[PDB]
Amino acid sequence: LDSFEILKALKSLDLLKNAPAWWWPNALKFEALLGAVLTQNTKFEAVLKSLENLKNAFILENDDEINLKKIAYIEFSKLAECVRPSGFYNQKAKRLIDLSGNILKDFQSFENFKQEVTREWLLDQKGIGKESADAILCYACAKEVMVVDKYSYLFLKKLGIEIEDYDELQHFFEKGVQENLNSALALYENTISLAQLYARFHGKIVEFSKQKLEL
């Protein structure tokens, strides 16, 4: 039992039949970063509502560099109101404003941020935990990082492997793929990157978990 065996078994279920290519809607865009922060301690359906609020208020429009600056400089109390649906909205608004201001300060642009950001930089941003930091790296920045979470902990535990520490659980999931890299990629025909693979693999675990299925 390794993560490559799990990948194959998950892949055979076609859990992503209706999902976009990177699973996370609007992957590789500022919106994915916003979602990665907002989804902490809540359900993604609520995240989608907060995003729609930001879009309906024209805070988030089609230019990501403009959107980054909009969040860096938005009045705190206005952002807090818009992100109410995803909960912890005062904390999350501050987290997003400080994060966006710090991205501009250290990376000048969202484009450069995607290239230069590290996990440690993200972890030094107050309120950003490993899961959110990792989701930004993989789903906003196309980095070769697999997000793990409570779902993945419980999913694996059920299969007979218990890994409580976030980083060790992530390493279990990443390593099975690394160790069988050609075979993993060949499940798709060399049409996708490893980052995209982890993007989808974490997606499969989430969908499998949400669906209450049996491997």
Ligand X SMILES: Cn1cnc2c(N)nc[n+](C)c21
Name the site residues for ligand X (rule: CB under 6 A): 23-24, 39, 44, 206
Rounded to a whole number of angstroms, the minimum distance from the CB of residue 31 to ligand X is 11
Rounded to a whole number of angstroms, the minimum distance from the CB of residue 123 to ligand X is 19
Rounded to a whole number of angstroms, the minimum distance from the CB of residue 203 to ligand X is 7
- Taking the least distance from each CB to ligand X, the nearer of 22 and 113 is 22
Which residue's Cβ lies closest to ligand X?
Answer: 44
- Taking the least distance from each CB to ligand X, the nearer of 92 and 104 is 92
- Taking the least distance from each CB to ligand X, the nearer of 4 and 155 is 155
- Taking the least distance from each CB to ligand X, the nearer of 104 and 146 is 146
49 CB-contact burial (10 Å; exposed 0-12 / middle 13-18 / buried 19+): middle
Rounded to a whole number of angstroms, the minimum distance from the CB of residue 210 to ligand X is 6
- Taking the least distance from each CB to ligand X, the nearer of 8 and 43 is 43
Answer whether 24's CB lies under 8 Å from 35's CB: yes
Rounded to a whole number of angstroms, the minimum distance from the CB of residue 148 to ligand X is 12
Q: What is the 3-state secondary structure (H, E, C) of the chain?
A: CCHHHHHHHHHCCCCCCCCCCCCCCCCCCHHHHHHHHHCCCCCHHHHHHHHHHHHHCCCCCCCHHHHHHHHHHCCHHHHHHHCHHHCCHHHHHHHHHHHHHHHHHHHCCHHHHHHHCCHHHHHCCCCCCHHHHHHHHHHHCCCCCCCCCHHHHHHHHHHCCCCCCHHHHHHHHHHHHHCCHHHHHHCCCCCCCHHHHHHHHHHHHHHHHHHCCCC
**Which residue's entry shows tokens 């892949």?**
11
- Taking the least distance from each CB to ligand X, the nearer of 39 and 196 is 39
CA–CA dist 90, 42 (Å, integer): 14
Rounded to a whole number of angstroms, the minimum distance from the CB of residue 186 to ligand X is 26
